[PDB]
CSV table of C-alpha atoms in Angstrom, one decimal:
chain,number,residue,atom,x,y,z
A,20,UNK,CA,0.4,44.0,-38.4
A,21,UNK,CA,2.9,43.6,-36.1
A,22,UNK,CA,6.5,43.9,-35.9
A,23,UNK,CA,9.4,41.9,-35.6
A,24,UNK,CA,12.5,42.9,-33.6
A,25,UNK,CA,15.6,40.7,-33.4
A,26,UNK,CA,20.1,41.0,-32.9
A,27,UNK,CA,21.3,41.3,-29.9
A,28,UNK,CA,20.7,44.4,-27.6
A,29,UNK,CA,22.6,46.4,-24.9
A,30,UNK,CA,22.5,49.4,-25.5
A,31,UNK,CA,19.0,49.4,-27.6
A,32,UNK,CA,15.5,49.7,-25.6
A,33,UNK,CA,12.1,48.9,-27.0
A,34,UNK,CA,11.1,53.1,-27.5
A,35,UNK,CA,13.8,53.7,-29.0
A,36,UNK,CA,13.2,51.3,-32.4
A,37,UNK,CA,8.7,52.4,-31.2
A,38,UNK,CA,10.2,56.5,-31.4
A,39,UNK,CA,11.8,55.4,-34.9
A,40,UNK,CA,9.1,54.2,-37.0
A,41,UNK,CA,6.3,57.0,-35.2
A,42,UNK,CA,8.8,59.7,-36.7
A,43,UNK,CA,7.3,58.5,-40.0
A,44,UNK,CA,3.8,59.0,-39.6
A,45,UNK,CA,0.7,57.5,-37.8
A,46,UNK,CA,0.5,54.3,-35.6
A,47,UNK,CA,-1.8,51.9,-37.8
A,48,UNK,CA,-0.2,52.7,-41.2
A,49,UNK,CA,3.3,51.7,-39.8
A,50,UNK,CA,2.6,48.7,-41.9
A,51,UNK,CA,2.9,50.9,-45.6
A,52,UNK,CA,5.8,52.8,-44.2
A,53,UNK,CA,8.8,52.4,-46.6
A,54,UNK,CA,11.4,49.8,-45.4
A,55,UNK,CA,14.4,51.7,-47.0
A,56,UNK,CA,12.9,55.2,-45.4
A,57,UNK,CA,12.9,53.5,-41.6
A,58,UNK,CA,16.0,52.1,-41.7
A,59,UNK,CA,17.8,55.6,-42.6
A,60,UNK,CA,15.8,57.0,-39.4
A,61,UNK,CA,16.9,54.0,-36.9
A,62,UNK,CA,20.7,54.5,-38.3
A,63,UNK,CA,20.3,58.3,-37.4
A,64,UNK,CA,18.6,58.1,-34.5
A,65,UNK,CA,20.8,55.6,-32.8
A,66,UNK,CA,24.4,55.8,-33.6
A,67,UNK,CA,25.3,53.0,-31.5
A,68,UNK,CA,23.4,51.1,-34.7
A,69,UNK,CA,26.2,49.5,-36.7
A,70,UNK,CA,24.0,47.4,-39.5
A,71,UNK,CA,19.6,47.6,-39.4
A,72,UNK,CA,17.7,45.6,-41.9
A,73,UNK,CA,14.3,46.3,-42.1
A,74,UNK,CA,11.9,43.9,-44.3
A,75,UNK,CA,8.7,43.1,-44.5
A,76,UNK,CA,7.7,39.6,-44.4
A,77,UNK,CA,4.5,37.6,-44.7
A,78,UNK,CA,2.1,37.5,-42.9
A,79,UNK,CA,2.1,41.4,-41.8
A,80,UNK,CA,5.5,41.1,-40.4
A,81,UNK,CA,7.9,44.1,-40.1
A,82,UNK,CA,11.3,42.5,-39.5
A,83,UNK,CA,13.7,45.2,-38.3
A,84,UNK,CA,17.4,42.9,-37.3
A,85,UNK,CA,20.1,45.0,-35.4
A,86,UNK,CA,23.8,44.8,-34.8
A,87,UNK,CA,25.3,47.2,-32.6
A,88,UNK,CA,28.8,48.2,-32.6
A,89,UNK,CA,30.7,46.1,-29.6
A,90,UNK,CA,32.8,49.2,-27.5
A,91,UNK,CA,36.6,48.5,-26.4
A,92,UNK,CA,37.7,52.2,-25.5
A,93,UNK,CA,36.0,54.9,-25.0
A,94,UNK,CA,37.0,57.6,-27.4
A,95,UNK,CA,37.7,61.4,-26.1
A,96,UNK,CA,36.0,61.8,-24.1
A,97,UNK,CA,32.4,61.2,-25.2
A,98,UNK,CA,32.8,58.5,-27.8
A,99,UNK,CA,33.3,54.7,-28.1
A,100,UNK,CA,35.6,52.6,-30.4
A,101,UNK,CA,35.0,49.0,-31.6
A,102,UNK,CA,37.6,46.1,-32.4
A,103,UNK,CA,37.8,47.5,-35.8
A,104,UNK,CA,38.3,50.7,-35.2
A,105,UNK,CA,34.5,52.0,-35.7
A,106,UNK,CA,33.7,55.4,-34.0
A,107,UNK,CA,30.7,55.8,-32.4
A,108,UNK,CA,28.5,57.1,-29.4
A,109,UNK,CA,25.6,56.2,-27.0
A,110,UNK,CA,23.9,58.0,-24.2
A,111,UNK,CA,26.1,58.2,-20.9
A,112,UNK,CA,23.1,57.1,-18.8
A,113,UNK,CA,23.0,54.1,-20.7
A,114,UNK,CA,26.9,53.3,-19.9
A,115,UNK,CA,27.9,54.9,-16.3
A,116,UNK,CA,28.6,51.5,-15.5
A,117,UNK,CA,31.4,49.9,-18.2
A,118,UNK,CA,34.9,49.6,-17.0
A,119,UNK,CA,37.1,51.0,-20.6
A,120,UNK,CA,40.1,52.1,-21.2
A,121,UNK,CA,40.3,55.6,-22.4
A,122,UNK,CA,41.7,56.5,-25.7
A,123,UNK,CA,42.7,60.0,-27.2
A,124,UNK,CA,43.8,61.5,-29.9
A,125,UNK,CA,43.1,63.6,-33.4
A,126,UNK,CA,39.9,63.4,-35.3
A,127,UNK,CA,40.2,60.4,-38.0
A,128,UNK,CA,42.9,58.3,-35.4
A,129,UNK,CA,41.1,56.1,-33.9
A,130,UNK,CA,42.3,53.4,-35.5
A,131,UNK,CA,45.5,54.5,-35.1
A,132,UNK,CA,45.5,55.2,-31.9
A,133,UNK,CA,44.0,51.8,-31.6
A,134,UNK,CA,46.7,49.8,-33.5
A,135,UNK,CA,49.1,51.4,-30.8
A,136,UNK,CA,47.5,50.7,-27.2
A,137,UNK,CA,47.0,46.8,-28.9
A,138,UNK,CA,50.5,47.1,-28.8
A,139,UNK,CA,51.7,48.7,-25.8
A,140,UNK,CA,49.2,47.3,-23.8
A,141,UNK,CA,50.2,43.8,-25.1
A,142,UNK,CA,54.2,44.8,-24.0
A,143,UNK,CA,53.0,46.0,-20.7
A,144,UNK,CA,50.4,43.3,-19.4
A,145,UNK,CA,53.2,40.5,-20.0
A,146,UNK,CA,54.6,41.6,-16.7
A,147,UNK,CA,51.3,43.1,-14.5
A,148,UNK,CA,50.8,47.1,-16.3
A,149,UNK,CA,47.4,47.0,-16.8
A,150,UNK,CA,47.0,50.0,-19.3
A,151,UNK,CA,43.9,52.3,-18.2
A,152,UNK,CA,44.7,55.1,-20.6
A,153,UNK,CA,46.5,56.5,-24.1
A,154,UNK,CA,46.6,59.6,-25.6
A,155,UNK,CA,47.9,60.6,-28.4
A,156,UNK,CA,48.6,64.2,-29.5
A,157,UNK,CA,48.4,65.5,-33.5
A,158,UNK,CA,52.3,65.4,-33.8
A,159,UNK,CA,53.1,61.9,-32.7
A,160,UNK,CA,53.6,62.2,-29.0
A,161,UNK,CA,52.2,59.7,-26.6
A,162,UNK,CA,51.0,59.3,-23.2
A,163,UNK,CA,49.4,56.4,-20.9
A,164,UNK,CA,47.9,55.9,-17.7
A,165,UNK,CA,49.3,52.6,-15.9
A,166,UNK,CA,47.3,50.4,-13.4
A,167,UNK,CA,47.6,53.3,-10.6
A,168,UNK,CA,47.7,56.9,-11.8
A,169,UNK,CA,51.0,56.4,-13.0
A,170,UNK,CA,51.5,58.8,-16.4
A,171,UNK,CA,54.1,57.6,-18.3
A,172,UNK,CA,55.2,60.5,-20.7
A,173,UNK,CA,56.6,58.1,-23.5
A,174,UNK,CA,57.0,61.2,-26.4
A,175,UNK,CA,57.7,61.5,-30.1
A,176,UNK,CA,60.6,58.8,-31.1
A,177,UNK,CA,60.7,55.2,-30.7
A,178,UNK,CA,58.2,54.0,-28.3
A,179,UNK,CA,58.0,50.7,-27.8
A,180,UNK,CA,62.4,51.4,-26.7
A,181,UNK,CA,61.0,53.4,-24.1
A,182,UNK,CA,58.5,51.2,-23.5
A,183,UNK,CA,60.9,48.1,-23.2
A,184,UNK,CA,63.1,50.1,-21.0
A,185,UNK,CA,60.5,51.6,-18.7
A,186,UNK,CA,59.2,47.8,-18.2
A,187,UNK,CA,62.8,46.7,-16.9
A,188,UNK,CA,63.2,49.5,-15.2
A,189,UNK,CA,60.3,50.5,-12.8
A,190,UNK,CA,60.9,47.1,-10.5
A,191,UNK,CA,63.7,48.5,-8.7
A,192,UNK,CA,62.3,52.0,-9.0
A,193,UNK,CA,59.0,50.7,-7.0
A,194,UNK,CA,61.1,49.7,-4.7
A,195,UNK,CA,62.9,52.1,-3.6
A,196,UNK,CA,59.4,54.3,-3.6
A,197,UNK,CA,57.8,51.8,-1.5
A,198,UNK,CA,61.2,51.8,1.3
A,199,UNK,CA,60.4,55.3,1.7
A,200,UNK,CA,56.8,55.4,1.6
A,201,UNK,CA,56.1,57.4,-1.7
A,202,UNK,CA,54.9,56.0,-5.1
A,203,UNK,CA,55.4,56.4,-8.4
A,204,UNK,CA,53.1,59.0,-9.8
A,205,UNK,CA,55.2,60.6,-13.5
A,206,UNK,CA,57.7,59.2,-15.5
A,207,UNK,CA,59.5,60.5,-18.2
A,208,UNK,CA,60.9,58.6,-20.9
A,209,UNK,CA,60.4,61.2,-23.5
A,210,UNK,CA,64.0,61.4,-24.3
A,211,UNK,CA,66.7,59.6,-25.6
A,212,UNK,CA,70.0,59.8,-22.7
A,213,UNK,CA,67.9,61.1,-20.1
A,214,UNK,CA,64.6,59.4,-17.9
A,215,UNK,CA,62.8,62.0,-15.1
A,216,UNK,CA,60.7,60.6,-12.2
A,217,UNK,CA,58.0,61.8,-10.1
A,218,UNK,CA,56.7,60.7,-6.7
A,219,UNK,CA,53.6,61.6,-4.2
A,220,UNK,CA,52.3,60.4,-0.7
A,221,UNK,CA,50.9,56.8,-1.0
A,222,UNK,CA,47.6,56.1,0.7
């Protein structure tokens, strides 16, 4: 008997496939346990799981094989989200440590919200914006966190307009925050005809 552990790991530790199969009875019969019965406890027990096979294979071998989903934002505010826009979550301890951006927004958007900070954030690091954060709210209304603290009320309409605009735009406003020792902490392109702009002490 003995057991056969293999995918690649990050976020998975040894007692945590051990606490899975103990659930199901006595250590010594873990060999009789049933295969389709162990994998439903690993998938529940570790939601950072994104496919387990578990086989049995001669001689006395338990194969268990893992794939765990692959974050790329962290989804409000204790969640993850994968490439594909897979939802998921995994003990903070086990993740103080990753530098993600931060997506919001309604339950069942992920993938939305997802399609959208591919796209803004593609618009945005083509000139030096690195985008830290994106929320978006049940109507269609948008907000992100530049490379500072910069929020960048973007709104409702058309926003990659806004966005466009904003990016030609915010040179010469940097500027002119810079000359007088402030920088830019707000802006609002919310609205067509009209922009609003924030400022605080730089450090």
């Amino acid at each position: 008997s003995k057991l056969v552990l293999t995918g690649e790991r990050h976020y998975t530790r040894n007692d945590d496939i051990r606490q899975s199969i103990l659930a199901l009875g006595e250590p010594g019969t873990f060999m009789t346990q049933d295969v389709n019965i162990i994998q439903t406890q690993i998938e529940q027990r570790l939601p950072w799981i994104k496919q387990v096979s578990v086989r049995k294979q001669w001689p006395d071998e338990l194969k268990i094989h893992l794939v765990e989903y692959v974050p790329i934002a962290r989804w409000n505010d204790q969640h993850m989200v994968d490439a594909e826009g897979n939802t998921f979550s995994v003990p903070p301890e086990r993740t103080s440590k990753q530098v993600l951006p931060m997506l919001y927004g309604p339950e069942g958007s992920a993938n939305e919200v997802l399609q959208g900070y591919r796209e803004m954030g593609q618009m945005l690091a083509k000139d030096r914006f690195t985008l830290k954060e994106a929320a978006m709210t049940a109507r269609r209304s948008w907000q992100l966190t530049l490379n500072n603290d910069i929020k960048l009320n973007l709104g409702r309409g058309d926003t990659m307009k806004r966005l466009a605009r904003f990016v030609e735009l915010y040179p010469v406003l940097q500027q002119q925050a810079q000359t007088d020792g402030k920088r830019i902490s707000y802006v609002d392109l919310r609205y067509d005809s009209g922009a609003a702009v924030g400022w605080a002490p730089l450090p």
